Amino acid sequence: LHSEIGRLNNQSLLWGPYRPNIYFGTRPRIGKSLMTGLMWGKIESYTDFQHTVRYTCEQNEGMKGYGWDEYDPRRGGIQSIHDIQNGLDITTSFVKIPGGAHGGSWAARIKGTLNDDAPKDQKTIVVFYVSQEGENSELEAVPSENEFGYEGDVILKGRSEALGNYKLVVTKGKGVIPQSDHDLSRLRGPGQTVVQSLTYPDEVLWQAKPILFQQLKAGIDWLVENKYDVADPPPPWQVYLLANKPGSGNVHIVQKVFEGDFEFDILFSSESAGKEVTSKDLEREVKQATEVFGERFARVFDLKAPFQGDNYKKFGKSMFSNLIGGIGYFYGHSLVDRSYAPEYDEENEGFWEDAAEARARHQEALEGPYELFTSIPSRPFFPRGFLWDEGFHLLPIADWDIDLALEIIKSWYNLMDEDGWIAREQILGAEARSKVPKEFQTQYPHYANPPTLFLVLDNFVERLRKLDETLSTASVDNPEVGLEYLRRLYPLLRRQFDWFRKTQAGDIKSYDREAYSTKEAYRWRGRTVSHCLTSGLDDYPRPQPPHPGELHVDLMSWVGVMVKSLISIGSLLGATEDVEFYTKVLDAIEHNLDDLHWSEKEGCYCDATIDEFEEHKLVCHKGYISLFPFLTGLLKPDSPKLGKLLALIGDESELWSPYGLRSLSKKDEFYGTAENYWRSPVWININYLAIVQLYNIATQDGPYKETARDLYTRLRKNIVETVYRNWEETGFAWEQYNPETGKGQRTQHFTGWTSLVVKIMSGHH
Numbered sequence: 001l002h003s004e005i006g007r008l009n010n011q012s013l014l015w016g017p018y019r020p021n022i023y024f025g026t027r028p029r030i031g032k033s034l035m036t037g038l039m040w041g042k043i044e045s046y047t048d049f050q051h052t053v054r055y056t057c058e059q060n061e062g063m064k065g066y067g068w069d070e071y072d073p074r075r076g077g078i079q080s081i082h083d084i085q086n087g088l089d090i091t092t093s094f095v096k097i098p099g100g101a102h103g104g105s106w107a108a109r110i111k112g113t114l115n116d117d118a119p120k121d122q123k124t125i126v127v128f129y130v131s132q133e134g135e136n137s138e139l140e141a142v143p144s145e146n147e148f149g150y151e152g153d154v155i156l157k158g159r160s161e162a163l164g165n166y167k168l169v170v171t172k173g174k175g176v177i178p179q180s181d182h183d184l185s186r187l188r189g190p191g192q193t194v195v196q197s198l199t200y201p202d203e204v205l206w207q208a209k210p211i212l213f214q215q216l217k218a219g220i221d222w223l224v225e226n227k228y229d230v231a232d233p234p235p236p237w238q239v240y241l242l243a244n245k246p247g248s249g250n251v252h253i254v255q256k257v258f259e260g261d262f263e264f265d266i267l268f269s270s271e272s273a274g275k276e277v278t279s280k281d282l283e284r285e286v287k288q289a290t291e292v293f294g295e296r297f298a299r300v301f302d303l304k305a306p307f308q309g310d311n312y313k314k315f316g317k318s319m320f321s322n323l324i325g326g327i328g329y330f331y332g333h334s335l336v337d338r339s340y341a342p343e344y345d346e347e348n349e350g351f352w353e354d355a356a357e358a359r360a361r362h363q364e365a366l367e368g369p370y371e372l373f374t375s376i377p378s379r380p381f382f383p384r385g386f387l388w389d390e391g392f393h394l395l396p397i398a399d400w401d402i403d404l405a406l407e408i409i410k411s412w413y414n415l416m417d418e419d420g421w422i423a424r425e426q427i428l429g430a431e432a433r434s435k436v437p438k439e440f441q442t443q444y445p446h447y448a449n450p451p452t453l454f455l456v457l458d459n460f461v462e463r464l465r466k467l468d469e470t471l472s473t474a475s476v477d478n479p480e481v482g483l484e485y486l487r488r489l490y491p492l493l494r495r496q497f498d499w500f501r502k503t504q505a506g507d508i509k510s511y512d513r514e515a516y517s518t519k520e521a522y523r524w525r526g527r528t529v530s531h532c533l534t535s536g537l538d539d540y541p542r543p544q545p546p547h548p549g550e551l552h553v554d555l556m557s558w559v560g561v562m563v564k565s566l567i568s569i570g571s572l573l574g575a576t577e578d579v580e581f582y583t584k585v586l587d588a589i590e591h592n593l594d595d596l597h598w599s600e601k602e603g604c605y606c607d608a609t610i611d612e613f614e615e616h617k618l619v620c621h622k623g624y625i626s627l628f629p630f631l632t633g634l635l636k637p638d639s640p641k642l643g644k645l646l647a648l649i650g651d652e653s654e655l656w657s658p659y660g661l662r663s664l665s666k667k668d669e670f671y672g673t674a675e676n677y678w679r680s681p682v683w684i685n686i687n688y689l690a691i692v693q694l695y696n697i698a699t700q701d702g703p704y705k706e707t708a709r710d711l712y713t714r715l716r717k718n719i720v721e722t723v724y725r726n727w728e729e730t731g732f733a734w735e736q737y738n739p740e741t742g743k744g745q746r747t748q749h750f751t752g753w754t755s756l757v758v759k760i761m762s763g764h765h
């Protein structure tokens with residue numbers, strides 16, 4: 001029955017607009033298969049279209065905003081795009097229609113409305129680009145009746161082992177098609193939909209922009225060769241209209257030119273499903289998806305006071321939809337240094353210079369291929385899987401669709417190598433690499449990242465203890481199913497736990513270090529003079545200089561998170577030998593957190609280092625790091641150390657701003673210095689952890705119940721209102737928020753863990 005649920009999930013989730021790196025395109029969760037993408041741009045001159053054309057996501061002055069208004073990966077959704085440069089408000093509606101044996105069918109409506117500013121007679125070029133990778137698969141444009149192109153719909157017939165037979169139709173559409181009175185029209189037609197059918201080696205099919213332009217360039221060269229010149233030039237939009245040449249190939253370019261508003265449909269009909277998809281089906285299925293989205297939202301994200309109003313609902317729907325709508329399918333090779341150079345052990349003083357020298361050996365090589373199905377932080381800036389981010393992303397996604405979350409967890413765990421390592425940044429394939437400078441592609445098998453995916457696992461476990469509708473919760477509703485999923489995943493969790501302890505070990509025994517346990521001590525590998533990227537808090541201040549004797553309290557706390565989850569999951573699976581080992585490790589971390597990391601003088605946890613005199617030293621920098629045992633849920637509700645942490649948390653002159661908790665205290669010598677990334681701004685992911693832990697203490701007997709209740713109330717409100725106020729004014733989720741001004745700063749479109757705000761509003765943790 002677990003096998004059955006699995007197959008049903010695969011069939012449910014196979015198709016999606018799973019190319020979040022581009023404004024709009026679709027691909028199935030198959031590495032080498034059929035992909036589509038949308039391009040559009042105004043044309044006002046003979047040279048502007050290369051500059052106006054839109055394809056890959058960006059964010060600059062020329063784009064007001066864009067995002068999913070509604071989205072569920074099993075059903076589809078609606079995206080809106082506000083393009084200032086091209087004076088167009090665009091909507092792309094995508095819908096899935098289950099049926100047959102190849103993952104069902106789907107349809108999209110693309111609608112473009114000129115805004116008030118655009119010339120009413122604007123010409124907009126629109127391209128639907130279709131490619132298919134695979135050795136024995138085929139795709140063919142059925143030729144038109146007419147001489148120069150298409151008066152009606154464009155029909156592509158294709159086949160592959162993965163998809164069986166299928167047809168993909170690009171409908172005629174509605175809107176004015178400009179007509180040219182030029183002599184050229186006798187050879188190219190007056191103006192009509194055209195198709196070019198081409199083949200390139202499969203591995204370059206993703207390069208849609210270059211492939212299109214090469215065809216446009218061939219067209220213009222033809223004009224030059226055939227005496228079309230500046231004495232009497234055809235209009236721009238006709239100069240840039242491809243000569244129709246439909247056929248067989250692994251690339252199909254479908255081009256339309258419109259004057260004024262336009263719309264057209266794409267209908268993907270899986271042959272194994274019977275009757276083909278129509279535009280009427282599309283309109284009906286779109287109406288249905290919205291009603292279903294609306295109903296699940298009200299149930300799953302029931303916003304509590306004071307955020308129950310419609311403004312907050314719309315805010316919540318926007319934040320949530322952008323998060324789950326960023327889900328992508330990525331496929332390809334990664335760049336990995338598999339030298340395990342000894343310099344990477346970082347055992348000596350000055351280790352960063354040694355590590356730099358090893359990296360300058362450039363032993364890294366491509367490996368894989370790998371696939372990943374994941375949500376992402378940022379469509380415009382880094383549309384790809386990041387390990388600790390995904391733990392935050394799946395917290396709301398799991399609420400919505402636990403089976404989906406587990407699907408993504410499984411996807412990530414399927415990347416884990418033999419040692420227990422998952423690269424913290426997944427850059428899969430040439431297309432993904434294109435967005436990343438080569439110096440930054442290389443992953444290192446000694447680099448960890450927080451195991452936040454365990455948090456998602458923990459929520460699943462408590463839920464396990466206490467058709468698309470049904471599928472979304474199958475793995476909790478059917479406890480046999482849920483448990484089997486854990487059984488299969490459990491060894492990889494255990495492997496990762498072990499990997500952390502082998503590779504991210506700190507050094508107690510080698511120094512004058514007294515502690516309850518001789519084993520429990522941790523140090524993030526990969527630190528440079530100013531950074532610790534692997535911890536996730538890039539430039540939070542750390543002992544200077546970095547040192548093999550460093551110990552990092554955040555990392556120890558993450559191991560505490562892991563072992564607690566392992567206790568839970570081990571228990572469920574009856575792994576008694578494992579549970580008793582975990583039990584002893586937890587007990588040990590509890591004591592060693594105090595013995596190595598507690599500062600009585602400072603009233604908080606500190607990282608530790610080793611003196612010029614070879615003695616243990618605490619290095620306190622009051623901020624997120626300082627609160628880690630509390631953020632990760634390792635402290636008892638009665639703990640006096642907790643009470644001291646609550647005092648720091650609530651203290652306005654340290655961490656507490658009107659807009660959330662500051663990453664670093666205003667009193668810290670490093671406040672607002674250098675790049676000031678994690679040295680003052682308010683970050684939603686860590687504020688979320690604080691909020692959840694305050695609420696835990698607030699809903700339980702203890703000395704700090706009321707304090708925590710008050711801090712919960714205020715921090716929830718502060719965080720929510722800051723993110724809302726910024727969304728209201730700018731339309732964006734931001735990466736972080738200014739604690740002086742409350743302004744969003746760093747990157748826009750960060751959905752992204754900022755979207756946690758929807759779960760904060762929902763409450764009842």
Ligand SMILES: O=[N+]([O-])c1cc(-c2ccnc(N3CCOCC3)n2)ccc1NCCCCCCN1C[C@H](O)[C@@H](O)[C@H](O)[C@H]1CO
Nearest residue numbers: 059377380381382386388389435436437535536537538747
């Ligand atoms: O590579 N870019 O395209 C790129 C572009 C821009 C940017 C900004 C404004 N404008 C422009 N313009 C137009 C576009 O191009 C450039 C010019 N660009 C900024 C950054 C990047 N890439 C940096 C990749 C590293 C991201 C780590 C983020 N997080 C760090 C957290 O600290 C960590 O915890 C967490 O896990 C991760 C993940 O969330």
